[PDB]
Every structure is written in structure tokens, then in C-alpha cells.
Amino acid sequence: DINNIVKTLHEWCDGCEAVLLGIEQQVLRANQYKENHNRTQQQVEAEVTNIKKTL
Amino acid sequence: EHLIAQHSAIKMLHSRVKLILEYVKASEAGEVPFNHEILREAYALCHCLPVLSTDKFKTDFYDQCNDVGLMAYLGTITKTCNTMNQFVNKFNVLYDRQ
Amino acid sequence: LVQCILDNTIHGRIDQVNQLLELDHQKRGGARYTALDKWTNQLNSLNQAVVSKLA
Amino acid sequence: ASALEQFVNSVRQLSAQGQMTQLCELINKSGELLAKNLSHLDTVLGALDVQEHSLGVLAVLFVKFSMPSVPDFETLFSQVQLFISTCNGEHIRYATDTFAGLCHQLTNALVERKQPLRGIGILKQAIDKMQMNTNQLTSIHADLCQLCLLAKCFKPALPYLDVDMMDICKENGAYDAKHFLCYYYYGGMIYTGLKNFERALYFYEQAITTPAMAVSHIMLESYKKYILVSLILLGKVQQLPKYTSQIVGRFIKPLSNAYHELAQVYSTNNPSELRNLVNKHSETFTRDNNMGLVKQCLSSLYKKNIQRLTKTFLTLSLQDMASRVQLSGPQEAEKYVLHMIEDGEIFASINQKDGMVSFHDNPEKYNNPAMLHNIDQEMLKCIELDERLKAMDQEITVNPQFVQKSM
Amino acid sequence: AFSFKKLLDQCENQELEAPGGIATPPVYGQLLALYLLHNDMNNARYLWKRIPPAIKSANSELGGIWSVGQRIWQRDFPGIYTTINAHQWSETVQPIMEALRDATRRRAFALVSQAYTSIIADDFAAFVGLPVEEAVKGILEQGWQADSTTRMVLPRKPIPNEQQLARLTDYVAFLEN
């Protein structure tokens, strides 16, 4: 059963690594969403400043 | 920050698992052929890794998920209706009078 | 038994067909989902009325 | 014909030299030469090329349709199909008024000849070419739904009707609200024929809330159809909102008195009395092009009575069920329950051994992944809703008036 | 089923793209049969009203399919099966007609199981379009209960982690801004 123990430990390690990679992908997605929100905010600010310069 | 905290916790557990696996491999190669109660309990815990849930536990988990998901839907509805109220207030100034 | 239940001293009812006294164990631990539902419905009708009046 | 040749040469020069706006204003110019001179436009068609040369041809095509001397429709329809297939309408969005009138004349000719089956496909192509996004509603949609209704072919509309189009096209100021009124009335009828009473009622409600200084027959019939669907689906007339409309509301209610009378007896909940009223007002509902809706109202009343029995009974016999809802026998009640269970309206069970029907509550304990998936789908719809609302709010912020008030 | 839906969509597109405005009789026959398969009675009824009487007179098979559709609307299963197996269906209609016959069996089988806690053997036999006796062994092998004395039949009524994570990330992204 040493082989079975090694297989179980390898499966646990692979699952942990997969969850870690998923968490990192969530990091990237959340950062991208924050960047998109910041881009929308800066676009709104630029539009407001352009209209202020127009008048 | 929330999932970074969970990431750190999972990293700690993964490091512990890596240490256990390395010890098992070393024992298979050299070290103590059988460290007695230690490898016994390690194998027992690896045999309790499946855990095995019953219909009731899965039902309760789905129940909590559905409840808090309905709460999330209510929160999204509140945010959407606030956005709608802001849009209506702006529209009533854009063209509408009174 | 009927007098005691009608006096709110007994939290249960009576099964006269089988000569049985069933008491409500009230183990659900709820009474908060009712408040959540009341809040949800009242404030959503409130929002609908506000939107209809403002539009 | 000399002027027409000059116009063709002018169109060719503006197209070959990259004069997008000059060609657009030339088409939008007087064009009296195209109006008075005819019998030479076929030569213009062959001589002129495709892409934006065909855009000038489209104006030439629109000129032909504007005259009662429209040429052989066999050759005309093939040329229209060739133009649509080889369409490069990168600038047709500027001349939306001409294209809208072309579709209206084509639809009127289709109704005159009673051949609305083929016009659905052509008008489907027409909407795709001119519209900017899938959330834009135009006048061609009203004619498209009319062709589907006359041809009794609701299959193509349902895809294009299941999308909410929150951007009306002014058609360069030529968009009359009659097209808007016709589209929702025709769209509601299409949904009604597909037993989609919820969307049909929604479309009828939107047509009701259209602000109008004058009441029209199309609006009047839309209100009447709204009552019929409300009686079928909800069992009662849904109250009109308070964002409302104009005198449309004021004038129609006295006018559509009979449908309110039908609703009043429907509220009394008596199929026998309701049937007697229908027989009394048979000719009153006959000018509807449909009498089945009244029969559907009666069936809905029977279904509503059966549904009300579930909320009050756990196990009821077929004989008692038939007596309560006034049926001819237990077999009819057995069939009615079976059909409603097939449609997914009732959760109950019948026991033929004892002649009993056992009603049951909702078997949904909200513990299955299906409810979670439905909630997540509604969540995605709500997030798309909020994104559209934020985009519209930003577009509002772009306006001059709010900035002037802010500055 | 999936191929039938694909065939229906192709036939639906051909009707819209009809050159002369009328489809070939095989297309109309396939369209009507496929509507009956999906129990889309409204579309089948409206298509039948759309078909000119010239095709109906020149193709008596089209009227036979409509007669079956009327039987399906009335939901008289013994009549439905009799009408299905009475008229000879061409090579383009025989396979889809049998699929409709199978669809009716499954529908009526589910209708009895859901609605009927108890049902007479003759009534169940009529509903499924089979004689009584082998219908009994068909449902006993289905794990149901049957009473021989009263001839009554007692039917027995019967998200991945990645998607969840994506939905929760969408929750947070929507509620963060």
C-alpha cells in the first residue's frame, strides 16, 4: 500500500496546485476588472475635462 | 486579499503535504523502513481524505449556497435599481420638464 | 389539552383521529427568513413605485 | 436622358474618388431628374456597379418604387435580392428614410398580392444591414411582424423578437410612431399565436404606454388584445402603470367597454355566466379576426378554478372536482388535470381505483443545482442590465445640458 | 432528436428561402411531421393553414398527416396510434412518423406515471396503444405494481467548480465598482 499512499499524496498535491492556479487566475481576473473600472473612470474624467476646456 | 489569505493557507497545507510525501519517499528509499505510529496515522489520514458526505450534508450545503446566492441576487437587484434611479433622475433633467 | 393550547401554554395541536397529541418542536430556528422576505417584497414594491412615479 | 447620364457619371466620380459624404448629399439632394425621367433607370441599373455604386442604385431602386409605374416585379425582386446579397451599405445608415419607405412600399405590395411568406426573409436581411446593434428597433420590424402574422409563419420573428431593442431609429426624422405602434401590436399577436402569453402581454403593455396625442385603431386593438391576454395569463386585467401615456388611456376605456364587461364577469368566476355573456356579445367580439382568444379565456378560467382547488384541497375526487368547476363528468376533469400536468401547471396525482385526485405542493425544496443555475442566469441578465444602464448614464453625462447646469 | 431538430431548421430555412414562394411537398411533409414530433401543435396548425388547398388536393398524404395532428390535438391515444399506423408514409415520412409514434409512447407513459397513482389496465393499455397483457409485463419489468383482481395499475413516480468560481468572480466584479 506504499504505492497507493504515494498515489494519494500525489493526487492531493496535484489538487492543491490546481486550486492554487485557480486562485492565481482569480487574482488576474480581479486585477483586470479593477483595471477596467479604472479605465472607465479615467475615460469619464478625460471626457469631463475635455468638455470643460471646450466651454 | 480574501483569496490571497486562502492561498496562503492552502500553501501551508501543501507544504505540509510535500514534507509528508518526501518523508514517505525517503522511507521507501532509506530512513526508517517503518516509523510505526507515524506512517500508520499518515496512511489512516490519507484514507480519511475522501471524507464521504451523506445526502443530508449535501442538502444542507446546497441550502446554504441557495440562501446566500438569493441574498447576492437581492444585493445585485438593489445596485441595479439604484443605477436605474440615477439614470431616471438624469433623464428627467436631460429632456423632461417638471 | 384543548384549553391549554388555546391559552398558548402548549405549542402543538391534537390528532383526535388517532388519539394523538403532536407538539411543535419548533427546531427550525427560523423566523428570520420571514423578516428577510418581508423586507425584500416591501422595498422592491417601494422601488417599483418610485421608478413608476419618477418616470 | 442626358441629365440621368450626368447623374450616373457624378455618382461614379464621387464613388471612385472616395467621396463618401459628397455621394450621400448627392443622393439626399433634389434629384428631380430621377423623378420626372423614367424608362431609362434599367440602363442605370446595369451600367452602375456594386458596393457604394449600388448605394446610388438603391436610391434609383427607391425612385422606381416611389412611382406607380413599378417595372416587372419578377425582374425587380431578383435585382433587389442581388442588391441585398451584394450589399455594401456602409453609408445606407445615412439614408434611413429612403430605405424605410422602400420597405413600407414593398410590404404594402406584398399585402396587396397576399404573398407575405417570402417578404419575411428579405425584411430580415434588411433589418440586419441598416441597424447598428441588436438592441435597435426600426420601422422594418413592424412590417416584418405583419408579414409573419399574415403568412402565419411565426418561426423567424421569435428569434428577433426575443431580443429587447432599446434604441429607436429616427429614420432621419421619418420614423412615425405608427411603425412603433404596429410593431408591438403585431409582435404581441405573434407571441399570442405561440402561446407566449407573458411576452405577448408585455408587448401589448408597451404599446399601451406609448404617448400619443391622437387615438388610433391600431392602438385601440392593442389595448383590447392586452385585456384578453391578461384574462388568460393572470386571470384579471393588469392595472396600467403610472408612467402611463396620453389621452390614449382617456379615450379607449369608454370605447373598449365590452372587454371590461368580459373582465367583470371573469372576475365573478362563473363559466356558465361567462359563456352566456359571450353568446350575448358574440358579434361584439367578432371584429377581432380571432374568436379563439375568448375560448382560451374560458379554458384559462377552468384552469384557474382547478389551480384554486389545489390551494384548498390535498385530495379531491373526480366527481366532486367536476361538480365544483361544473364539468360534464369525471372523465373531462381527468383529461383537464392530465393536460395541465403535461403543461407543467399542476403538481397532483389521480387515483382511478378510488376516483380521487391527490393534489401536492411544489416539490421544489430549492436544494437542487437547477434553481442555482436559474438564479445565476438571472444574475447574468441583471449584470448585463446594469452595464447597459451605466452605459446609458454615461451617454447622458455626455450631453450639453447637464454639463451646462453643472458648470 | 438532434438530427430531427437540425432537419427541422434546414426545412424551416428552405421555406423562408423558397424561390417561387412555395416549398416542395417533401419539405412541407417533413415540416408538418417534425412539428408533430415536438408536440408544437400551434406551429403545425398554422403551417397547415398556410399551405394552399392545391397542395392538399394534389397530395392526400398531407391531409392524412393533418388528420393525425388533429388526433394529437384531441389527445385520443387509441385513435392517434390507429391513424399513425393506418396511412402509408413515404420514405421521407415513415422514419419521422415512427419517431412521433415513439414520442407519443414516452409522453403517455410519463403522463400515466405522474398523474395516475392507480389506473385500470384497459385504460393504460389504451393510453399506450398496446393490448393489456404484455403491457403488464412491460410495467412490472419497470418496477411497478399491478393488481390482477381489480385490473388496476399502480405506477411508481420517479455545476462544476470552474463555473461556480466564474460566477462568484462575476459577483465580486459587479459589486466592486
Place this chain on the structure above:
Amino acid sequence: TQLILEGLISARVDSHSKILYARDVDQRSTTFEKSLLMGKEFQRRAKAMMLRAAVLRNQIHVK
């Protein structure tokens, strides 16, 4: 039966054995059902308001 139709008895009639069984519906199931109905109505009203905004912005009205 009349009292159940009017209310304030909260019961179901079992005409088979002629026994009146009281109704104790789960609060959560009804809450979820009416919350889903509320969400559907809110989506419908949002669509209605968006259409109203579209027709008002584009100046669409019967002359």
C-alpha cells in the same frame, strides 16, 4: 371550503377520508418563489423603463 377560499383557517381538505389537515408551508420555499417572481417582475419593469427611455430620447410619439 368557503373559509379556506376567504382565508384565516390555513387548511387543506382531504375529501377521501374526510379529514381536515392543517397547512404548514415552509417559509423558505415560499420566500424563494416570491423572490424569483419579484426578480422577474423587476426585470420586466427594467425592460419597460429602458424602452420608455429609448422612445423618449429618440422623440417617438404619434402626431
